[PDB]
Amino acid sequence: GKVYKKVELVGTSEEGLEAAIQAALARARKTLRHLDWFEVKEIRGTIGEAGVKEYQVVLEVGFRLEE
Amino acid sequence: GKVYKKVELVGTSEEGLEAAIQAALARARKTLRHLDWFEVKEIRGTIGEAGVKEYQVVLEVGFRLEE
Amino acid sequence: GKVYKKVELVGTSEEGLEAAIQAALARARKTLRHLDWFEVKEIRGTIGEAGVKEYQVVLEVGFRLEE
Amino acid sequence: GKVYKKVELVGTSEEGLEAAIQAALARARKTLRHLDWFEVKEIRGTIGEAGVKEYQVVLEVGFRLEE
Amino acid sequence: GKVYKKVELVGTSEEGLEAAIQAALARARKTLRHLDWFEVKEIRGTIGEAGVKEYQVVLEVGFRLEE
Amino acid sequence: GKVYKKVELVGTSEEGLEAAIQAALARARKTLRHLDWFEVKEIRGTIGEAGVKEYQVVLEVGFRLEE
Amino acid sequence: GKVYKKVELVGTSEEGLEAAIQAALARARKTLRHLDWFEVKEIRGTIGEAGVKEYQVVLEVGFRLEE
Amino acid sequence: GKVYKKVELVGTSEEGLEAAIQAALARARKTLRHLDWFEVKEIRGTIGEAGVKEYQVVLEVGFRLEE
Amino acid sequence: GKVYKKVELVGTSEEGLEAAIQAALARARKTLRHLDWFEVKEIRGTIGEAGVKEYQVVLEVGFRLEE
Amino acid sequence: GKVYKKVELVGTSEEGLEAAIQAALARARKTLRHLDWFEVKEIRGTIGEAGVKEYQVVLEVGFRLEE
Amino acid sequence: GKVYKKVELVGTSEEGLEAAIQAALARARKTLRHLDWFEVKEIRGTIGEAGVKEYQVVLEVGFRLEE
Amino acid sequence: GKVYKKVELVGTSEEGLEAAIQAALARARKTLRHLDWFEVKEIRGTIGEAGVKEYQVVLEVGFRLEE
Ligand SMILES: Cc1cc2nc3c(=O)[nH]c(=O)nc-3n(C[C@H](O)[C@H](O)[C@H](O)COP(=O)(O)O)c2cc1C
Ligand SMILES: Cc1cc2nc3c(=O)[nH]c(=O)nc-3n(C[C@H](O)[C@H](O)[C@H](O)COP(=O)(O)O)c2cc1C
């Protein structure tokens, strides 16, 4: 009876992996409703002069569809 | 020339796998047009006192984009 | 000593997943002998006005080779 | 804080896929407690004179560990 | 800080693989903004009397989300 | 009701990827009937003094079985 | 001569990924002996009003079997 | 210009893995011509009272198609 | 009706791959009953001064559950 | 007796997929000797105002090691 | 025109996942030039008396090749 | 603190799988130092008039990086 949708996002952060995930979820909840779960598909990033420049976490976000 | 889009849905049902797929497709067709095919990516579910509580079928739905 | 062969078939049905599998196996046994096991590789289908038009079960069929 | 364990089972049935899953879950709940979810990893089976002899559903069962 | 979204499209063409990709991207840029990268997930197609009828390139398109 | 079979071929060409696919399909249609679709599984090749010697496209070809 | 066993656990934590792993390992060492290594299979989680509710790390734990 | 075909076989042997592969290739060369390469997809087997009863090597065999 | 369980083991040996598998199965049969089949998931090992120090075969062992 | 090494390269081109592969192989042969084969692992690219800006082909290059 | 190379490293740390990545990148930049991006392939580790002994992050590092 | 590197090799032998692995490791230790572990990625080979001509084992070799 219930139907969910999954959207694929890429959260980024200079701080770490959790912050990268949280950035994705923060943006997701502005536009999507009934956010339930997430699944990390991929962890990558960019490299700068001091090592990791940007952590990039490719993420699926699952949420309940209405009506 | 033709371009399609794929959306990832999770259909659920207490009855079985086909009903779970049909629940996803029924909801899809309310909002999406030119639904053509589907691809089952994953079959999971929740467990209750009497065994399977809910069947959950993770599904990609392909449809033609307009214009 | 024994050698088996695997053939990849796609069974279809408007009724459900088991019927799709059975359609593949019914056709397989007309031409192939010593059918032993099957492995479902993929579940997909077509969509019509009333939801699932056709279930399509991609299937490997394993059978013993003679001689 | 919570920790879960996953066990891999193979449920079988001459009837169909749901019944195969249910057979696994029925046996699981005799010995395991706090059964929460399952994930189907694989669908296979044996072939007889009348097509499918036995459906075999390879399944992961997730449950909460105590203390 | 930056968040991207990925959408899955299927571009088609009778001419070849690059044209199939380009058809997807051309349609994508009508509706989506800040298109950055793509990832080919799958190459398939239909067969006609003269060989390949239609090339079909399943593609993920990544773009920056605003705000 | 309808049952398809999939055969795995490797098409080769010194020209490019599309030609390699077309070589596989051209040979397929001499012996197989009711060719419907293809799925590229793998792209590889051999290297010579001037770069790519031979493109090799590993391909599944799907066709309807008769009777 | 030596034989190891692998058990699949899911560690959870509201804090982060390392804490989720550590929760799994802490529970593991209460019951299992000769714990040697782990392999992360999957990172997922639940979503709440403030973003990540629970981080869930699916983990294989390898340990030496006795006698 | 050249087109190859791949057939999937399962070689078995009570001796070991190489013998299992050789059993498959021996049977293959009775019926197939221009055998070129093989790819091991899977290694499994049956268990008896003295350990391994039968080694089973699932194998793809590639060969050149004529004309 | 019948339900099986799968356990994941790592057999090791300085001799070779078969011996590594047999070591796993020998230990398995001391504690587990109704051992039926195995599936090799992974082959790895350690390196010493004379090449392979230890072969390590990651293996799933399937057995029938009682009552 | 023979040992090969595989190196992973990313060839790029504004023209197409073959040219991207050829760019990788051209650079490879300046530094590496006894180049034998390649395997395409991934096809991606960047997007510009006119569609595909750059095709990027992630490629494994296999070559014979000396002495 | 541009060609990149990918090298596979395993960074380790007793502190956490980010530190493990950073250790790999720190060592990489001593010897490699034009480091651009990384891709995490695998997360594993060793277990000690107090849980995680060492986090081990298997990582691909991509960098631009010169001239 | 410690960083490892992984190199991908293909060992070959007319004798068997272990010998193929050993050939790769023998060549590796001439040029690489602090060789620790290996992971078999793939088993393939060539076919001759008497069955297996050459066994080919695709192998990752992991070793500790210095300074
Ligand atoms: C990549 C992709 C996958 C498809 N898979 C299937 C398949 O699952 N089974 C099927 O019957 N048709 C499949 N089709 C064909 C579509 O279902 C549909 O019949 C065809 O694309 C025509 O769509 P249209 O008339 O809306 O343009 C596939 C098409 C594409 C683009
Ligand atoms: C690689 C392979 C996979 C098999 N998978 C199954 C399985 O799915 N379930 C099962 O009951 N038997 C399985 N079997 C055993 C066969 O179903 C069959 O019982 C056995 O090969 C003996 O049959 P035969 O007398 O025709 O040689 C498998 C055998 C092989 C070779």
Ligand SMILES: Cc1cc2nc3c(=O)[nH]c(=O)nc-3n(C[C@H](O)[C@H](O)[C@H](O)COP(=O)(O)O)c2cc1C
């Ligand atoms: C996960 C992900 C994958 C990316 N893959 C590529 C790549 O395929 N090739 C490339 O040139 N850039 C790649 N990029 C970088 C983007 O193409 C883009 O240049 C960058 O995100 C900055 O764009 P922005 O200003 O729109 O944020 C990737 C970025 C992310 C988030």
Ligand SMILES: Cc1cc2nc3c(=O)[nH]c(=O)nc-3n(C[C@H](O)[C@H](O)[C@H](O)COP(=O)(O)O)c2cc1C
């Ligand atoms: C599992 C499978 C995969 C398919 N994939 C595609 C797809 O790649 N693209 C497409 O246009 N049609 C796809 N089709 C649809 C077929 O190409 C074909 O149009 C349809 O099955 C009707 O075939 P028939 O008229 O010979 O019975 C697929 C069909 C099946 C069975």
Ligand SMILES: Cc1cc2nc3c(=O)[nH]c(=O)nc-3n(C[C@H](O)[C@H](O)[C@H](O)COP(=O)(O)O)c2cc1C
């Ligand atoms: C299949 C398998 C995988 C292993 N993976 C790792 C690895 O991830 N990192 C590591 O440091 N050790 C790894 N080990 C080695 C063990 O952690 C341990 O150091 C070694 O087996 C010695 O254990 P023992 O003294 O109990 O016999 C692995 C061992 C096996 C059998």
Ligand SMILES: Cc1cc2nc3c(=O)[nH]c(=O)nc-3n(C[C@H](O)[C@H](O)[C@H](O)COP(=O)(O)O)c2cc1C
């Ligand atoms: C990612 C990775 C995978 C490993 N896998 C194994 C394993 O397959 N089996 C094993 O015995 N050791 C494994 N190890 C541990 C190494 O073989 C080695 O024993 C350990 O890293 C100590 O090496 P060192 O003294 O040079 O620092 C692994 C180590 C790493 C980093």
Ligand code: NA
């Ligand atoms: Na972290």
Ligand code: NA
């Ligand atoms: Na069903």
Ligand code: NA
């Ligand atoms: Na092309």
Ligand code: NA
């Ligand atoms: Na062997």
